Amino acid sequence: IEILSEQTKSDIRNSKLVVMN
Amino acid sequence: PTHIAIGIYFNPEIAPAPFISLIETNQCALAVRKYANEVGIPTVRDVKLARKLYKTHTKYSFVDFEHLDEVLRLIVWLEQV
């Protein structure tokens, strides 16, 4: 069971942070 | 709407504005949060900023001059610590 695609995983790995509500 | 995730990148050699690397909502947003935490990417809650960026921006774009400092304040705190 994988929810995220490879490109989204990469985008996350390449970020300084994730902002959430 | 219910759940928002905005990825933020930053490199001062390219521009003084932060860069939005992802925008996801609801269930996908929750998966972004879990993965981020699993791979050691800080996840910071700021409900008004999350909404703002979601309502004003498209993915893979720089934060506009108007919201630049509000976003940059998070990066600066994470650097102070």
Residue numbers in the entry:
A (entry chain A): 237 to 257
B (entry chain B): 258 to 338
Copied sentences from the primary study:
The pathogenic bacterium Shigella flexneri uses a type III secretion system to inject virulence factors from the bacterial cytosol directly into host cells. The S. flexneri protein Spa40 has been identified as a component of the basal body and is predicted to have a large, N-terminal transmembrane domain (Spa40TM) and a C-terminal cytoplasmic domain (Spa40C).
The structure was refined using data to 2 Å with residuals Rwork and Rfree of 17.8% and 22.7% respectively. The structure of Spa40C consists of a central β-sheet surrounded by four α-helices. The structure of Spa40CC starts at P258 and consists of four β-strands and three α-helices that wrap around β1 of Spa40CN. The NPTH sequence lies on a loop between β1 and β2, the PTH region having flipped away from N257, revealing that the cleavage of the N257-P258 peptide bond results in a conformational change to this loop region. P258 moves ∼10 Å from the catalytic asparagine residue and both P258 and T259 are less well-ordered than the surrounding residues, as indicated by higher isotropic temperature factors. In Spa40, the face of this helix that is exposed on the surface is composed of residues K305, R308, K309 and K312, resulting in a highly positively charged patch.
